[PDB]
Design a protein around this ligand. Structure first.
Ligand SMILES: *[C@@H]1O[C@H](CO)[C@@H](O[C@@H]2O[C@H](CO)[C@@H](O[C@@H]3O[C@H](CO)[C@@H](O)[C@H](O[C@H]4O[C@H](CO)[C@@H](O)[C@H](O)[C@@H]4O[C@H]4O[C@H](CO)[C@@H](O)[C@H](O)[C@@H]4O[C@H]4O[C@H](CO)[C@@H](O)[C@H](O)[C@@H]4O)[C@@H]3O)[C@H](O)[C@H]2NC(C)=O)[C@H](O)[C@H]1NC(C)=O
Ligand SMILES: *[C@@H]1O[C@H](CO)[C@@H](O[C@@H]2O[C@H](CO)[C@@H](O[C@@H]3O[C@H](CO)[C@@H](O)[C@H](O[C@H]4O[C@H](CO)[C@@H](O)[C@H](O)[C@@H]4O[C@H]4O[C@H](CO)[C@@H](O)[C@H](O)[C@@H]4O[C@H]4O[C@H](CO)[C@@H](O)[C@H](O)[C@@H]4O)[C@@H]3O)[C@H](O)[C@H]2NC(C)=O)[C@H](O)[C@H]1NC(C)=O
Ligand SMILES: *[C@@H]1O[C@H](CO)[C@@H](O[C@@H]2O[C@H](CO)[C@@H](O[C@@H]3O[C@H](CO)[C@@H](O)[C@H](O[C@H]4O[C@H](CO)[C@@H](O)[C@H](O)[C@@H]4O[C@H]4O[C@H](CO)[C@@H](O)[C@H](O)[C@@H]4O[C@H]4O[C@H](CO)[C@@H](O)[C@H](O)[C@@H]4O)[C@@H]3O)[C@H](O)[C@H]2NC(C)=O)[C@H](O)[C@H]1NC(C)=O
Ligand SMILES: *[C@@H]1O[C@H](CO)[C@@H](O[C@@H]2O[C@H](CO)[C@@H](O)[C@H](O)[C@H]2NC(C)=O)[C@H](O)[C@H]1NC(C)=O
Ligand SMILES: *[C@@H]1O[C@H](CO)[C@@H](O[C@@H]2O[C@H](CO)[C@@H](O)[C@H](O)[C@H]2NC(C)=O)[C@H](O)[C@H]1NC(C)=O
Ligand SMILES: *[C@@H]1O[C@H](CO)[C@@H](O[C@@H]2O[C@H](CO)[C@@H](O)[C@H](O)[C@H]2NC(C)=O)[C@H](O)[C@H]1NC(C)=O
Ligand SMILES: *[C@@H]1O[C@H](CO)[C@@H](O)[C@H](O)[C@H]1NC(C)=O
Ligand SMILES: *[C@@H]1O[C@H](CO)[C@@H](O)[C@H](O)[C@H]1NC(C)=O
Ligand SMILES: *[C@@H]1O[C@H](CO)[C@@H](O)[C@H](O)[C@H]1NC(C)=O
Ligand SMILES: [Ca+2]
Ligand SMILES: [Ca+2]
Ligand SMILES: [Ca+2]
Lengths: 107, 389, 389, 389
């Protein structure tokens, strides 16, 4: 199984700034990385797939990236409603393995 | 025929699609000496149509099957065998040696082209009438590759699309013009197309159209039209919002004809389209992210319109089944008023998505068009990855 | 031949039957790559005779063999291979794709017809000279089916019997007339026949006779005579008390020519007969309830007489052995004063009756007639269901 | 052709080498019915090129594969099969029976020659047009042997080099001249060459050149030129310090043209060379002691100069991979201004060096020349001796 490791677990950024969430796999997963966002007390929304392609209607603030075993999700002009638990799933081989999440707190 | 062929006719009305061939290779392959292959295609002689594919030089059960994810190796061989049989050890015909290829009959004999090599010292040898006639070497030294479909010939001239260079950058594409295996001319890519890979070509009315893959930025395909009479070409993207590469962003409402449609970069999967005004049909995988499902959608004036949405469709492979590469082929020697339009879909099985086995492989489905509006079925490879364990 | 064929001759005197072919497929199949098939038949080119059958796309040993009881699937393919060989992966010729079929040579090239589909959106494509020429779609949307024997051609015109509709009700049968793959005419069933299925046809003297199956109420077969010159037909039942469908009630003393003979409904098994006055021979399974045994009985003026009991017979398969489908074929290009009359019997092995294996399959026996009164043998498939365990 | 062939053309400029064929037999052979062979070669009909080899009469997996180190046995058979397929049980064509052979097409039909026998009572039968025409018996009673490459024909006359005698002493070589299977003349070896074995021959400009093996003292090859028009020949050694037999002493700075170059005696491995002045290419194993690696080196005026060191090279098989026998072949019926120069390398696998299996066997690589200076790859047999355990 491929193993997605998310560190750090908590992130604080101020309203209007940048944050970036780092995800990493245990072998070259050849860019097959998806990012979900889980809003508190809601279901996940798929933001990005294939490391950087946005799903239908996640506004361009969210910028997926990466390569090999190291990927990252950047968010800009951080909104007080950006608070959520962010997870990377991988989508190269079965079974589709997630990360631990990162809570983005608003300073 | 005893004479070269001229593409005198035009396409017939595509109104639905009918099954033309299905080899069932992995299903049979669990117990016969079916060869591991990938990148298939189909091509017609004036006398018969055969399935062609890039062999990996091992049977699917054989222990050397493990690790066939690798595209290029020196155990790759371009083979052919009868229409709708499996690539069997005891009936494939090896056409030339290499890991990239195109093949097509000019009316008299056929040309096969197999590229072989180290990734920085690759070399093509242009076989004509089963004899090695010409050889071209790498101009940009980073993987010299060609079509993985059949080329079309006209009056002896068969244009062929070769790309050497980066699949991640600008590459160095070039159209070559063969007549009887010799190089008549070769010219560099021109047009608004940013990067060309794995071109799918059909010929009608003395013009050949190729629908390719932009690996770099495209999610909308580059179309190259080539004029085999004057040995000239141009390229553009397909204007339609209906995006056909895979992966892709979800289709816009307005598409893009003179630049890549921005979204999924450094990736694609070979494909085709029949581009003919009202009678345009585009093929695409259903998944925006994976080679699963295949469908044919009629999108009138797709090539030229930045607003063309579909008006009729047909399902070929369900989204719950796997697909892969697709390309165009036609029987130029089929007696008619017109050219029957056909395509094939490769059905990948194995690694990476079914990694419980260590081999990758495929079977083939192919359709041709009918003017009747026939009913549709959906055509699964069919094997159970669990009986190979 | 380089010219179309006219059925100029008439049958020869049937006086006994001699073995023409026996493939021994399941027996060999325990150790070679013999294909799982069912619904076989035989057809002759002007140059050679071959065995044709509907493949299930798996070897009998292969693990995908399990579950081949199902008649229709998209892994079915109509194949042919040499007379008296097994359907081998490495020598069958795939003729078209689908789960119903007919095929026959018009003298010049041959027509093959394979129906494919969902049960409510089925489609036939009429291949001529190994190229797809025409396609007809479902008129009644509940399983479009055709012969599972060979069709007969005359002067280019080959009538073909198609039934779409219910196998339990009124269905919607129709005779189609092909010349060179194109549809010359098509007309609805007519005559007193209540329901037509799986017609067996032979041609003599410029008329083609089909002996079919009434699934619905018949236990006596519908006979359709077709006139390929004027493209007309009529249907009736066979008058004889000698009932030939299976299952059936036990034979009466007076039979029925203008209605089904009442008794076993919603069921039958494909069959044939040579209908020629004094020289009429009917084939039937021996069991009134199961496809076991096969015999040929001479019942003079069977077609026209409600009292015709047999006068000579011959045993083909014992009642302790299994049989199945049967149909007529002839070598129209066999040099003679007359047409040698032949038939084939399919020999089913597997599920449901031998359910210790999970595959169904079959072999073939075929006979032609002799005027000598030869001795008889009885011709078992031959395999032991216990060596496959 | 319908007419005999005259070697009218001369060689083309050898500037690099391109892959012509690769059968991948041991790799496939782990799971198909690939035959155990050894001593391969290639030969061209006016209509097609095929791979020929000496079969050992067993499949590589079959249990009789064990012990195929032995060169001669009565289960040896000279076979042929299509270019770049494996020697498969179901598609090899047996050419004659024996353990030594040559074969070649004279333009009309082909001659095959298989020697069979006890080592002291051996007999050759010269088949022409697949019928046994002539037979020659042992003159020196200690293993009668011939080429293990193809012979060249000119105007019906095909010279063939036969050696009976000791492989450790003086043997008794003799050039025979066949026309249409009959013996036109035969003459004894002449020239400064001390001992001839396994001659490799190509024809150009109505002269045939053979590059052989001196088993006895040579580490530099004997070259025989034969004049097929006058039925005369001479022999000499190759002057170059570049030693090409295997084993060999390490190359001197001055070589030897009229005597064996002293160093490794009672041993060698069959080989070839294209001898043409500036355009001379010699092939050799890389190891001075073992059949591993194969390379082609251009050594101008090699034949005539005792100081010729190489000026361009190409790697065919790496030194970490195994090689074996090599020889020349050409397509005399290939349309050109000139003769394309080709060679094959046999790739031995098994005993004695990979004795974890009990069979010896091989696959084939073949190249032809290109005038372009193409890039090089290195072409491994490819199987893992560990999957056969
Ligand atoms: C007997 O057989 C006949 C003959 O085949 C049957 O009739 C045919 O039935 C077909 C399916 O019912 C029918 O196809 C449909 O045709 C319409 C035109 O009216 C066409 O729009 C449809 O195509 C869209 O929908 C399919 C799924 O339904 C999508 O997979 C496809 O991609 C098309 O939609 C996507 O792209 C559009 C264009 O940009 C967008 O507008 C749309 O929002 C959608 O977007 C998403 O999907 C994309 C791919 O997943 C993705 O990239 C994108 O980003 C979005 O996520 C469809 O083909 C035939 O027209 C009809 N033919 C005939 C002759 O009648 C008959 O029903 C059968 N009878 C029975 C009883 O079974
Ligand atoms: C050497 O070889 C030669 C050449 O083959 C041998 O001679 C042949 O031998 C045959 C068998 O001995 C012989 O066949 C018989 O011919 C008579 C005519 O005289 C014919 O009646 C027979 O057919 C009936 O009987 C068989 C069993 O014997 C039944 O299976 C068959 O169905 C026929 O009977 C059924 O239908 C009849 C018609 O309606 C009814 O009247 C009858 O009651 C019976 O009814 C039941 O059976 C049905 C099916 O099971 C069922 O539907 C129904 O409801 C009832 O339940 C038989 O074919 C050949 O005529 C003869 N030929 C020649 C040229 O001589 C020779 O003996 C061999 N020599 C040696 C030494 O071995
Ligand atoms: C893309 O592809 C192209 C096209 O192929 C590449 O260019 C080619 O590259 C080749 C290798 O780089 C090059 O070959 C070399 O050519 C020189 C001539 O300048 C030739 O001397 C070389 O041959 C000797 O060296 C090899 C190993 O390098 C030996 O294995 C060989 O036997 C030759 O040396 C031995 O014999 C000589 C003659 O007597 C002695 O002088 C020498 O001391 C040596 O002796 C030992 O070795 C013997 C065998 O092991 C043994 O018997 C003896 O006793 C001693 O122990 C070599 O072939 C091509 O010329 C070149 N061609 C072209 C058209 O450019 C290009 O590099 C590729 N590009 C990339 C980016 O990869
Ligand atoms: C070939 O297939 C074998 C299985 O047949 C693969 O074996 C695994 O390989 C890894 C190293 O990659 C070993 O550590 C595992 O223990 C093996 N186990 C299993 C269950 O497969 C092998 O890697 C495959 N690949 C190649 C190129 O040989
Ligand atoms: C395929 O064959 C297998 C045996 O190879 C069948 O397996 C049985 O299936 C039932 C369910 O139908 C299981 O509960 C049994 O335990 C299985 N056991 C045995 C002894 O066969 C399987 O059903 C077959 N059918 C298909 C369509 O796969
Ligand atoms: C044939 O192969 C077998 C193995 O399949 C060889 O068997 C060995 O033979 C020796 C005698 O030469 C025995 O003492 C060994 O115990 C055998 N063991 C093993 C592990 O192979 C046999 O020699 C081979 N040779 C022939 C000609 O039959
Ligand atoms: C084919 O087309 C060329 C022009 O493209 C024409 O000159 C030639 O004669 C044509 N030949 C045939 C058989 O149509
Ligand atoms: C075949 O029969 C038709 C009438 O059915 C006749 O006109 C035609 O000429 C015949 N041809 C041959 C070769 O018998
Ligand atoms: C072949 O060559 C001989 C002389 O070697 C000559 O007499 C003969 O006529 C030639 N034939 C052909 C077709 O060249
Ligand atoms: Ca792309
Ligand atoms: Ca009934
Ligand atoms: Ca020596």
């Amino acid at each position: 199984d491929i193993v997605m490791t998310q560190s750090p677990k908590f992130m604080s950024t101020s309203v209007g700034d940048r944050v970036t969430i780092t995800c990493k796999a245990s072998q070259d997963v050849s860019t097959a990385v998806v990012w979900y966002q889980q809003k508190p007390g809601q279901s996940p929304k798929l933001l990005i797939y294939w490391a950087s392609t946005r799903h239908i209607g996640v506004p361009d603030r969210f910028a997926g990236s990466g390569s090999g075993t190291d990927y990252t999700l950047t968010i800009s002009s951080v909104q007080a409603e950006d608070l959520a638990l962010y997870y990377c799933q991988q989508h190269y081989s079965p079974p589709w393995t997630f990360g631990g999440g990162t809570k983005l707190e608003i300073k | 025929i005893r004479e070269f062929n001229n593409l005198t006719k035009g396409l017939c009305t595509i109104n639905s699609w009918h099954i033309y061939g299905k080899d069932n290779a992995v299903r049979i392959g669990e117990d016969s000496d079916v060869l591991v292959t990938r990148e298939p295609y189909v091509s017609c002689d004036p006398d018969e149509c055969r399935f062609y594919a890039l062999s990996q030089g091992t049977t699917i059960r054989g222990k050397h099957s493990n690790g066939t994810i690798h595209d290029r190796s020196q155990y790759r061989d371009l083979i052919s065998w009868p229409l709708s049989s499996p690539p069997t050890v005891y009936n494939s015909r090896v056409e030339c040696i290499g890991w990239s290829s195109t093949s097509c009959h000019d009316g008299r004999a056929r040309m096969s082209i197999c590229i072989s090599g180290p990734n920085n010292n690759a070399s093509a040898v242009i076989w004509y009438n089963r004899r090695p006639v010409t050889e071209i070497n790498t101009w940009a030294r980073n993987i010299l590759r060609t079509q993985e479909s059949e080329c079309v010939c006209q009056n002896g001239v068969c244009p062929v699309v070769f790309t050497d260079g980066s699949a991640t950058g600008p590459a160095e594409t070039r159209i070559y013009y063969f007549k009887e295996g010799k190089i008549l001319k070769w010219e560099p890519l021109t047009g608004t197309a940013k990067h060309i890979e794995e071109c799918s070509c059909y010929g009608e009315q003395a013009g050949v159209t190729c629908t390719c893959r932009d690996n770099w930025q495209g999610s909308n395909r580059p179309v190259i039209q080539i004029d085999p009479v004057a040995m000239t070409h141009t390229s553009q993207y397909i204007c339609s919002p209906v995006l056909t590469d895979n992966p892709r962003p979800n289709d816009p409402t307005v598409g893009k004809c003179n630049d890549p449609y921005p979204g999924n970069n450094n990736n694609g999967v070979k494909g085709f389209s029949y581009l003919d005004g009202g009678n345009t049909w585009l093929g695409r995988t259903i998944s925006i992210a994976s080679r699963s499902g295949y469908e044919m959608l009629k999108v009138p004036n797709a090539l030229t319109d930045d607003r063309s949405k579909p008006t009729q469709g047909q399902t070929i492979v369900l989204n719950t089944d796997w697909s892969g590469y697709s390309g165009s082929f036609m029987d130029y020697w089929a007696e008619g008023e017109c050219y029957r339009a056909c395509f094939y879909v490769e059905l990948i099985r194995g690694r990476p998505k079914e990694d419980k086995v260590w081999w990758t492989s495929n079977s083939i489905v192919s359709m041709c068009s009918s003017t009747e509006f026939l009913g549709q079925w959906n055509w699964p490879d069919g094997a159970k990855i669990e009986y190979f364990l």
